[PDB]
């Protein structure tokens, strides 16, 4: 089988700490990896050098992926998810609608292989938790609710 | 009274008198429903889950799987090795190391030094520098062996876990489930029967229970499938289980 996707760097930062003598930067990269077929995953590793920072996050990325339930080209249904103070909210849209969302949620949704969405935002427009923000969204989309409400329950 | 179980080993008991002013509390024995350490509550609940668990130990066995047991309390440890070597698998007595499982690709390195050292004290390379390093390599080989004496059978992360007390060796159980590894443990009232994957509601403590639950867990494996061989095992020479084979000094 195959474990290779397409990577996209969301947002990098130098962080600076402080010591006797001066300062000391630590870099932060925020990457998203995806198939465009249902799998995507965020990742943000730090390092004394951006590249490693990216690579690392490239590894943290691929480790935290989430098969997204795409119907046609959209999300099956609606969802709004609370994070730090961010409140991403995605709404399934007809075809030919376009992505339509922020740098972050777009970077993510566009790798999950979506094509038509409308996004809801309402707080801490922080590249980071909006990042995570868009993901639990993608983690909460439903596959088989149809099953859980009507199936038996043996060994729980 | 020692029903043929105690054995008269010239055990004085001169310092063992009850002169320890033990005749002080009347309520000394707050006694409850735990007088010998054999609890089985709800039965239709526990026996149900047992069959469950022990049905897997059998499965993991046959499927060729591996099961490293995890021991940390003095109230076990050694009781973990016997049921260890008897059942060709990896065990952990001494202490867990952060990552034992979530870092294999690195703790396993230690296992490598271990083996590496274990090589050198077999070739002529013995004694080529100051005693200092000679010992520098002995301390290691020694330490390494103390904490890695059982992890040498883990060429790859295991298919299961058998931690005794999924509350005292919780890190173990965390690391485990974080890696989708069915976690098997003893557990009681003072434990997380939610964390334990395949429970066996025995007594977390209590040597006896341990040896009792852990053994069959070892025998069930061993007896995986079967065979003829009907001359039964011998008594007194059951040394291959380990016992105290060959001393050094």
């Amino acid at each position: 089988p195959e474990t290779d996707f397409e990577e996209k760097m969301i947002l990098i930062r130098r962080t600076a700490r402080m010591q006797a003598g001066g300062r000391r930067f630590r870099f932060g990269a925020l990457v998203v990896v995806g198939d465009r077929q249902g799998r995507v995953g965020l990742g943000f590793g730090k390092a004394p050098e951006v590249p490693l920072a990216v690579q690392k996050a490239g590894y943290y990325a691929r480790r935290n992926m989430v098969e997204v339930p795409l119907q046609n080209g959209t999300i099956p249904h609606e969802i709004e998810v609370e994070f730090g103070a961010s409140k991403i909210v995605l709404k399934p849209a007809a075809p030919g609608t376009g992505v339509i969302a922020g740098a972050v949620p777009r970077a993510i949704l566009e790798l999950a292989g979506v094509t038509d969405i409308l996004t809801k935002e309402l707080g801490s427009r922080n590249p980071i938790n909006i990042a995570y923000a868009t993901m639990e969204a993608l983690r909460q989309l439903r596959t088989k609710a149809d099953v859980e409400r009507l199936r038996k329950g043996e060994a729980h | 009274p020692v029903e043929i179980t105690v054995k008269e080993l010239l055990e004085a008991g001169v310092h063992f008198g009850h002169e320890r002013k033990r005749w002080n509390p009347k309520f000394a024995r707050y006694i409850y429903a735990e007088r010998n350490g054999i609890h089985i509550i709800d039965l239709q609940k526990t026996m149900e889950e047992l069959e469950r668990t022990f049905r897997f130990i059998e499965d993991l066995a046959m499927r060729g799987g591996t099961i490293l047991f995890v021991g940390t309390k003095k109230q076990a440890q050694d009781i973990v090795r016997m049921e260890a070597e008897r059942a060709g698998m990896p065990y952990v007595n001494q202490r867990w190391l952060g990552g034992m499982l979530t870092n294999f690709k690195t703790i396993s390195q230690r296992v490598h030094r271990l083996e590496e050292l274990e090589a050198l004290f077999a070739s002529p390379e013995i004694e080529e520098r100051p005693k200092k390093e000679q010992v520098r390599l002995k301390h290691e080989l020694e330490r390494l062996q103390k904490y890695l004496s059982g992890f040498r059978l883990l060429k790859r992360l295991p298919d299961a876990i058998f931690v005794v007390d999924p509350t005292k060796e919780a890190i173990a159980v965390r690391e485990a489930r974080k890696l989708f590894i069915p976690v098997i443990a003893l557990a009681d009232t003072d434990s997380d029967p939610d964390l334990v994957d395949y429970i066996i509601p025995g007594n977390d403590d209590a040597i006896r229970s341990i040896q009792l639950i852990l053994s069959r867990a070892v025998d069930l494996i061993i007896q995986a499938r079967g065979g003829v061989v009907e001359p039964s095992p011998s008594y007194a020479l059951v040394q291959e289980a380990e016992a105290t084979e060959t001393p050094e000094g």
């Binding site: 099956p76 249904h77 609606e78 399934p92 439903r142 609710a145 859980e148 409400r149 009507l150 329950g153 060994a155 729980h156 | 965390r174 489930r177 974080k178 989708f180 939610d194 964390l195 994957d197």
Partner: protein, 138 residues
């Protein structure tokens, strides 16, 4: 003294499920009893059965969950992931027929209370009526 009889029930089910209890009891009453009839026909809860405790009627709602999961935090997914009250007291929310809600894009219901029994977004629309929007479950 309760203030909103229903809301009480809904919640009593909500927390109940968050801690994974097997079933919870709630003060009985036609209405609540008719409101649970839906959660039951719809699968959010194995069911309810009139029961007595101390001498006062109560309803045992046998909650329904899912299977245990793999990885950390093995607790079972939820059947009733969300159950809110819409039409609160001193806030009466009645909707027309063309105003009935769609709810969780058909993944969830929305119990209405039309002059024709207690129905769900579906039925109510199917029958062609609207009324107090009691809740929204999914």
């Amino acid at each position: 003294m309760l203030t909103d009889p229903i809301a009480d029930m809904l919640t009593r089910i909500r927390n109940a499920t968050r801690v994974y209890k097997e079933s919870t009891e709630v003060p009985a009453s036609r209405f609540k009893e008719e409101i649970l009839k839906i959660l039951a026909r719809e699968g959010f809860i194995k069911g309810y059965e009139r029961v007595e405790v101390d001498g006062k009627p109560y309803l045992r709602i046998h909650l329904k969950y899912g299977p245990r999961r793999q990885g950390p935090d093995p607790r079972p997914e939820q059947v009733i992931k969300h159950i809110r009250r819409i039409s609160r007291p001193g806030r009466r929310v009645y909707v027309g027929v063309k105003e009935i809600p769609r709810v969780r894009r058909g993944l969830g219901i929305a119990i209405l209370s039309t002059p024709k029994g207690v129905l769900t977004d579906r039925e109510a629309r199917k029958l062609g009526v609207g009324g107090e929007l009691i809740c929204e479950v999914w």
